[PDB]
Design a binder for these strands. Structure first.
Length: 152
DNA sequence: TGTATTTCACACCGCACCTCAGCGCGTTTTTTTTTTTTTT
Protein backbone atom coordinates (compact mmCIF):
# COMPACT_ATOMS: atom_id res chain seq x y z
CA UNK A 1 0.00 0.00 0.00
CA UNK A 2 1.64 3.17 1.34
CA UNK A 3 -0.61 5.66 -0.44
CA UNK A 4 0.39 8.71 1.62
CA UNK A 5 0.75 8.57 5.39
CA UNK A 6 1.35 11.04 8.20
CA UNK A 7 5.03 10.08 8.59
CA UNK A 8 6.11 10.92 5.04
CA UNK A 9 3.95 14.04 5.22
CA UNK A 10 5.67 15.17 8.42
CA UNK A 11 9.17 15.06 6.99
CA UNK A 12 7.82 16.47 3.70
CA UNK A 13 6.60 19.46 5.68
CA UNK A 14 9.84 19.65 7.66
CA UNK A 15 11.73 20.00 4.36
CA UNK A 16 9.57 21.94 1.86
CA UNK A 17 7.16 23.56 4.37
CA UNK A 18 4.05 22.68 2.34
CA UNK A 19 1.73 19.71 2.68
CA UNK A 20 0.90 16.87 0.31
CA UNK A 21 -2.84 17.27 0.95
CA UNK A 22 -2.51 20.87 -0.30
CA UNK A 23 -0.76 19.96 -3.56
CA UNK A 24 -2.89 16.84 -4.26
CA UNK A 25 -6.11 15.42 -2.91
CA UNK A 26 -7.55 12.19 -1.78
CA UNK A 27 -7.93 8.63 -3.11
CA UNK A 28 -7.54 5.57 -0.89
CA UNK A 29 -9.10 3.57 -3.75
CA UNK A 30 -6.05 1.92 -5.31
CA UNK A 31 -8.11 1.17 -8.43
CA UNK A 32 -8.92 4.73 -9.57
CA UNK A 33 -6.35 5.93 -12.10
CA UNK A 34 -4.97 9.18 -13.52
CA UNK A 35 -2.22 10.19 -15.93
CA UNK A 36 -0.79 12.95 -13.72
CA UNK A 37 0.71 12.11 -10.33
CA UNK A 38 2.86 13.57 -7.56
CA UNK A 39 5.62 11.78 -5.67
CA UNK A 40 8.10 12.21 -2.84
CA UNK A 41 10.61 9.42 -2.18
CA UNK A 42 12.85 8.85 0.82
CA UNK A 43 16.33 7.37 1.22
CA UNK A 44 17.64 8.11 -2.28
CA UNK A 45 21.17 8.72 -3.55
CA UNK A 46 21.67 11.87 -5.61
CA UNK A 47 23.28 10.02 -8.55
CA UNK A 48 20.21 7.87 -9.14
CA UNK A 49 17.98 10.92 -8.59
CA UNK A 50 19.71 12.76 -11.43
CA UNK A 51 19.42 9.49 -13.35
CA UNK A 52 15.74 9.50 -12.35
CA UNK A 53 15.09 12.57 -14.48
CA UNK A 54 17.17 10.69 -17.07
CA UNK A 55 15.04 7.53 -16.97
CA UNK A 56 11.56 9.00 -16.54
CA UNK A 57 11.88 11.77 -19.14
CA UNK A 58 10.98 9.24 -21.85
CA UNK A 59 7.34 8.75 -21.41
CA UNK A 60 5.70 11.67 -19.59
CA UNK A 61 4.38 14.98 -20.88
CA UNK A 62 6.24 16.69 -18.02
CA UNK A 63 8.53 15.78 -15.11
CA UNK A 64 9.75 17.90 -12.19
CA UNK A 65 11.95 16.76 -9.32
CA UNK A 66 13.66 18.52 -6.43
CA UNK A 67 15.82 17.27 -3.59
CA UNK A 68 16.92 17.90 0.01
CA UNK A 69 17.99 17.57 2.95
CA UNK A 70 19.57 18.55 6.29
CA UNK A 71 21.11 15.63 8.16
CA UNK A 72 17.74 14.09 9.07
CA UNK A 73 16.21 12.28 6.12
CA UNK A 74 15.98 12.86 2.38
CA UNK A 75 12.65 13.61 0.68
CA UNK A 76 13.18 13.59 -3.09
CA UNK A 77 9.95 15.20 -4.30
CA UNK A 78 8.84 14.41 -7.85
CA UNK A 79 6.13 15.73 -10.13
CA UNK A 80 5.09 13.04 -12.60
CA UNK A 81 2.59 13.41 -15.44
CA UNK A 82 2.69 10.34 -17.67
CA UNK A 83 1.53 10.00 -21.27
CA UNK A 84 -1.06 7.25 -20.67
CA UNK A 85 -2.84 6.92 -17.33
CA UNK A 86 -1.53 4.25 -14.96
CA UNK A 87 -3.00 3.22 -11.61
CA UNK A 88 -1.43 3.65 -8.17
CA UNK A 89 -0.32 0.01 -8.24
CA UNK A 90 1.18 0.29 -11.73
CA UNK A 91 2.97 3.59 -11.11
CA UNK A 92 3.85 2.24 -7.66
CA UNK A 93 5.55 -0.75 -9.29
CA UNK A 94 7.27 1.58 -11.76
CA UNK A 95 8.70 3.86 -9.08
CA UNK A 96 9.54 0.98 -6.74
CA UNK A 97 11.44 -0.52 -9.62
CA UNK A 98 12.98 2.94 -10.07
CA UNK A 99 14.41 4.05 -6.75
CA UNK A 100 15.89 0.97 -4.93
CA UNK A 101 13.89 1.51 -1.73
CA UNK A 102 10.83 -0.07 -0.14
CA UNK A 103 7.26 0.40 -1.31
CA UNK A 104 7.01 2.50 1.90
CA UNK A 105 8.23 5.90 0.75
CA UNK A 106 5.93 6.45 -2.25
CA UNK A 107 3.40 9.31 -2.30
CA UNK A 108 0.83 8.58 -5.00
CA UNK A 109 -2.21 10.86 -5.45
CA UNK A 110 -3.62 12.76 -8.43
CA UNK A 111 -2.76 16.48 -8.49
CA UNK A 112 -5.45 19.05 -7.78
CA UNK A 113 -6.41 21.35 -10.67
CA UNK A 114 -8.14 24.04 -8.54
CA UNK A 115 -5.77 25.15 -5.77
CA UNK A 116 -3.33 28.00 -5.18
CA UNK A 117 -0.52 26.37 -3.20
CA UNK A 118 -0.94 23.26 -5.37
CA UNK A 119 0.91 25.15 -8.10
CA UNK A 120 2.76 27.74 -6.01
CA UNK A 121 4.78 24.86 -4.54
CA UNK A 122 6.00 23.64 -7.92
CA UNK A 123 6.29 27.20 -9.28
CA UNK A 124 8.79 27.89 -6.50
CA UNK A 125 10.46 24.51 -7.10
CA UNK A 126 10.91 25.32 -10.81
CA UNK A 127 13.47 27.99 -9.89
CA UNK A 128 15.52 25.67 -7.67
CA UNK A 129 19.01 24.74 -8.98
CA UNK A 130 18.49 20.95 -8.80
CA UNK A 131 15.02 21.12 -10.39
CA UNK A 132 14.85 19.26 -13.71
CA UNK A 133 11.97 20.20 -16.02
CA UNK A 134 11.01 18.72 -19.39
CA UNK A 135 8.72 20.43 -21.87
CA UNK A 136 5.43 22.07 -21.04
CA UNK A 137 4.28 22.06 -17.44
CA UNK A 138 0.93 20.26 -17.04
CA UNK A 139 -2.19 22.37 -17.60
CA UNK A 140 -2.92 22.39 -13.84
CA UNK A 141 0.13 24.37 -12.64
CA UNK A 142 0.62 25.74 -16.16
CA UNK A 143 -2.99 26.91 -15.57
CA UNK A 144 -3.08 28.02 -11.93
CA UNK A 145 0.05 30.22 -11.82
CA UNK A 146 0.77 30.63 -15.54
CA UNK A 147 -1.14 30.99 -18.77
CA UNK A 148 -0.66 34.59 -18.41
CA UNK A 149 0.06 36.99 -21.30
CA UNK A 150 3.72 36.33 -22.10
CA UNK A 151 4.26 39.91 -23.29
CA UNK A 152 0.91 41.48 -22.37
C1' DT B 1 -16.48 -17.72 6.37
C1' DG B 2 -12.53 -14.13 6.08
C1' DT B 3 -10.58 -11.36 2.29
C1' DA B 4 -8.02 -9.81 -2.47
C1' DT B 5 -9.83 -7.25 -6.22
C1' DT B 6 -13.31 -3.88 -9.45
C1' DT B 7 -17.19 -1.50 -12.42
C1' DC B 8 -21.87 0.65 -11.38
C1' DA B 9 -23.88 4.66 -8.71
C1' DC B 10 -25.06 9.75 -6.63
C1' DA B 11 -22.15 13.30 -7.20
C1' DC B 12 -17.77 17.16 -5.70
C1' DC B 13 -16.81 20.25 -8.85
C1' DG B 14 -16.49 22.21 -13.90
C1' DC B 15 -14.75 23.40 -18.75
C1' DA B 16 -17.31 25.73 -21.61
C1' DC B 17 -20.95 26.12 -24.34
C1' DC B 18 -24.94 29.41 -26.00
C1' DT B 19 -27.92 33.70 -24.78
C1' DC B 20 -29.17 39.09 -24.71
C1' DA B 21 -28.66 44.49 -25.81
C1' DG B 22 -26.59 48.28 -23.35
C1' DC B 23 -21.97 50.41 -24.42
C1' DG B 24 -19.25 52.48 -28.73
C1' DC B 25 -21.34 54.88 -34.50
C1' DG B 26 -21.91 61.21 -38.89
C1' DT B 27 -20.29 65.10 -42.74
C1' DT B 28 -19.16 70.79 -44.42
C1' DT B 29 -15.81 72.25 -50.26
C1' DT B 30 -17.34 74.91 -53.05
C1' DT B 31 -19.55 78.77 -54.68
C1' DT B 32 -20.46 83.15 -53.47
C1' DT B 33 -17.89 86.07 -52.11
C1' DT B 34 -18.30 91.73 -54.77
C1' DT B 35 -14.70 91.43 -57.00
C1' DT B 36 -13.97 94.84 -62.13
C1' DT B 37 -15.12 93.26 -67.06
C1' DT B 38 -18.69 91.77 -69.75
C1' DT B 39 -21.60 95.60 -74.47
C1' DT B 40 -21.43 101.15 -73.19
Amino acid sequence: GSRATVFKLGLFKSLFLCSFHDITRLFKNDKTTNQQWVLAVFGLAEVFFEASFELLKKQCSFLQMQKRSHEGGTCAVYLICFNTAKSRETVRNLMANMLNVREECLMLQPPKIRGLSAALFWFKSSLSPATLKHGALPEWIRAQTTLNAAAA
